[PDB]
Amino acid sequence: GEEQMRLPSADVYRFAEPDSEENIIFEGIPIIKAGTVIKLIERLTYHMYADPNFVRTFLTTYRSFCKPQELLSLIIERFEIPEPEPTEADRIAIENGDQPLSAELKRFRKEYIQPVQLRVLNVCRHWVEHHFYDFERDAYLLQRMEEFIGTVRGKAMKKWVESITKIIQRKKIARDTFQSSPPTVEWHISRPGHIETFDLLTLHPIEIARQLTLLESDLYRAVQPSELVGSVWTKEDKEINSPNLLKMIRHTTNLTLWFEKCIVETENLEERVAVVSRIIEILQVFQELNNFNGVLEVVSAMNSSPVYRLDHTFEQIPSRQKKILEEAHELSEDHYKKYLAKLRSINPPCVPFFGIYLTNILKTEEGNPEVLKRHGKELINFSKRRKVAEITGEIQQYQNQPYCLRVESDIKRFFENLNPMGNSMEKEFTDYLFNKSLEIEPRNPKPLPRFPKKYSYPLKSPGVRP
Numbered sequence: 001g002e003e004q005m006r007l008p009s010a011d012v013y014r015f016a017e018p019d020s021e022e023n024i025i026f027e028g029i030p031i032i033k034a035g036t037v038i039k040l041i042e043r044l045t046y047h048m049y050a051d052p053n054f055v056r057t058f059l060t061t062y063r064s065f066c067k068p069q070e071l072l073s074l075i076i077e078r079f080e081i082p083e084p085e086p087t088e089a090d091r092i093a094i095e096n097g098d099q100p101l102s103a104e105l106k107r108f109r110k111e112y113i114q115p116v117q118l119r120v121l122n123v124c125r126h127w128v129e130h131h132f133y134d135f136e137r138d139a140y141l142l143q144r145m146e147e148f149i150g151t152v153r154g155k156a157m158k159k160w161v162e163s164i165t166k167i168i169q170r171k172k173i174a175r176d177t178f179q180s181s182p183p184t185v186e187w188h189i190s191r192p193g194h195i196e197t198f199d200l201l202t203l204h205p206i207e208i209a210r211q212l213t214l215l216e217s218d219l220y221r222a223v224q225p226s227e228l229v230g231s232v233w234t235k236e237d238k239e240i241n242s243p244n245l246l247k248m249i250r251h252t253t254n255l256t257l258w259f260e261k262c263i264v265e266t267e268n269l270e271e272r273v274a275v276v277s278r279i280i281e282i283l284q285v286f287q288e289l290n291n292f293n294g295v296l297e298v299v300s301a302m303n304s305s306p307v308y309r310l311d312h313t314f315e316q317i318p319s320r321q322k323k324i325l326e327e328a329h330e331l332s333e334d335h336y337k338k339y340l341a342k343l344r345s346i347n348p349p350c351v352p353f354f355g356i357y358l359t360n361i362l363k364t365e366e367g368n369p370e371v372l373k374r375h376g377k378e379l380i381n382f383s384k385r386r387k388v389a390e391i392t393g394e395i396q397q398y399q400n401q402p403y404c405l406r407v408e409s410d411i412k413r414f415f416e417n418l419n420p421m422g423n424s425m426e427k428e429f430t431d432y433l434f435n436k437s438l439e440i441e442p443r444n445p446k447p448l449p450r451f452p453k454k455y456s457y458p459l460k461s462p463g464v465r466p
């Protein structure tokens, strides 16, 4: 009918075929459940209406079903719409040197070409504003984009190309505050500048939790939603696709294993009790600062196979410290029911627990198919990508929460350069920590031997009250 005859032909344009059950599925503006790459590009730049929500989700998750170079090629192809031939009367008019009426041509330009071309430029604008890392990783992709927007010609196009260029240059320049003063940097045995003496018991427990909270807050903020889509941090290409996310995981692994190392490598029972007691105090300050990432790193260390079995150590831990640690584990029970209720009720700033998002994203990635088949044709399951994008939205909700705490470069460097494993691998190092646990506290039939002290300085804690 008239409705399809107005649109371009399939032999000159791929984004004008009619919708059908074997190319697009849906769950006002309709929500797309699934579709082919072409139908998703068509709807990403639809002529009848703007769709900010779909544009957001598409540019966060597209890399799981389409490469950046391919997406750029597709939207340029969509922008290049062929105009219809003049009507028979208008071709007689043109062949006679007269101006044609061109009534349908003028309408097709106003109601289809101009809106689609403006929607393609909106996609380019959101792409460089919220996902510039695609262009930093691929310099060939940036020069292709700049050649395209640079050759665009038009009245309304003029303002759009200028704003896209303004963003690109501002992002290029980006590659090259608090109402209150921060509290006083606390010191215990180690004096400022004496980096050689820095360790768990020599540094102040308040300042350890403060500097780790600043470090973990900075790491949490650097992660981009795209680093988590398609489980790309578990794939072969992860150092370039998930650089910030891997630093967050590696820090959590290094710190959790460092706490375990500090515990099992302290063979004297009474000294080991003071180490555990100090790590619990460090967790108390993480609770004060609403750093749930830090609280659940300590819980992870206390629940590990080498530390959880040290019954003689936790027997000497006061009941108050025991209750603090027990309630911290309760944060994780019932699929983090208590943690989530706490996170929603607290006042900012905070560092949310990051592992729950990776867990829930991997469950969605494994529990939903990549495609949906209909009439023998495979369609990209876009709702799968939308569910993952909603979880990464929860992550962004807390990435604008800086802390009024003074940075101490020597202490920051100590926690950044943590290397408990040394030249050993994780499986081999955890085997060592468990075998060490059995040495310091043997299994029931075997007796409990005594070991010599290793710390020359005093073991008493200065506390957590500043």
Ligand SMILES: COc1cc2nc(C)nc(N[C@H](C)c3cc(N)cc(C(F)(F)F)c3)c2cc1OC
Pocket: 299, 302, 303, 304, 307, 308, 309, 314, 317, 321, 322, 323, 325, 326, 327, 328, 329, 330
């Ligand atoms: C069914 O499994 C578990 C149940 C748990 N229930 C509770 C209440 N706390 C736990 N863990 C906390 C973090 C903790 C660890 C250690 N090492 C010492 C103490 C304490 F009490 F001595 F201080 C507390 C649990 C860990 C479990 O599995 C690993």
